[PDB]
Every structure is written in C-alpha cells, then in structure tokens.
C-alpha cells in the first residue's frame, strides 16, 4: 500500500491509504419569489376546491327549499280543488232540489186551473 499523512490534531489524526491508483486520469435553483408563487398557487387551488364544495352544498340548500315549497303548493292546490268541487256540487244540488220542488208545485197548480175550468163549465150548464 501507499500511506499518505493528512493531518495531526489534538483529539486525533488522519491519513490516506491507497491500494491502487485510478485506471483513468481525471474525473469524467428557485428564487424566493418563485417559491412564493408556487405556495400561493397551491393555496388558490385548495380554496377553489373548497369554494366549489360549498357551492354544491348551497345548491342542495336551495333544492331543500324547493322541496319544502312544492309540498306547500300541493297542499294549497289540494285545498283549492277541494273547495271548488264542493261548492260546485252544493250549488248543483240546490238548483236540482229547487227545480224538483218547483215542478211539483207547478203540476198541482195546473190542477188548480183545471178545477176552475170544471166549476165554470158547471155554471155554463
């Protein structure tokens, strides 16, 4: 071997042991601004994602309102159709019942005229 002294100090010494020389003579960055741009760009992607999530939850809130609203419109339309149907059949029944009673009293009144014709024909004899 070839030993080569390197150094001697207070708490030690060093040297170099060479067993074979080399076969071959010789041997064969972001700025502060750049870093801050990429940290800020990632933050704005985080925030855009959060904003889109909250946007979808907002869309669900309004659907919830529209469902609750539709049920109230169905109930109101149930009431309105029930009200108009009932009033229709109540008035039709009234008209019918009055029409029947008027016809019944009309027949008995023709009889009343006929009785006057009988009594006149008698005095005519």
């Amino acid at each position: 071997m070839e030993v080569i002294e390197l150094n001697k100090a207070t708490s030690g010494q060093s040297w170099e042991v060479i067993l074979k020389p080399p076969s071959f003579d010789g041997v064969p960055d972001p700025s502060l601004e750049e870093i801050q741009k990429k940290l800020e760009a990632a933050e704005e992607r985080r925030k855009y994602q959060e904003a889109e999530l909250l946007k979808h939850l907002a869309e669900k809130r309004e659907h919830e309102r529209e469902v609750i609203q539709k049920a109230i419109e169905e109930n109101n339309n149930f009431i309105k159709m029930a009200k108009e149907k009932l009033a229709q059949k109540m008035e039709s029944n009234k008209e019918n019942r009055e029409a029947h009673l008027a016809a019944m009293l009309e027949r008995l009144q023709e009889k009343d005229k006929h009785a006057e014709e009988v009594r006149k024909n008698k005095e005519l004899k």
Binding site: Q13, S14, L19, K20, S23, F24, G26, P28
Partner: peptide, 27 residues
C-alpha cells in the same frame, strides 16, 4: 486494511483511486 485487500475484492469506479481516508478520534 492490508488483510481485507488481499482476501476481498473492493471495486472502485475507474476514475477514482482505490483506497481509504482514515481518521482516528481519540475520544
């Protein structure tokens, strides 16, 4: 070091010397 170099093959790259830097710290 002399014993292992005769018994063992220690392959350095071509462009680098085959050997060791040795330090002793007495602590």
């Amino acid at each position: 070091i002399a014993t292992i170099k005769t018994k063992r093959s220690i392959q350095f790259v071509d462009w680098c010397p085959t050997g060791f830097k040795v330090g002793i710290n007495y602590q």
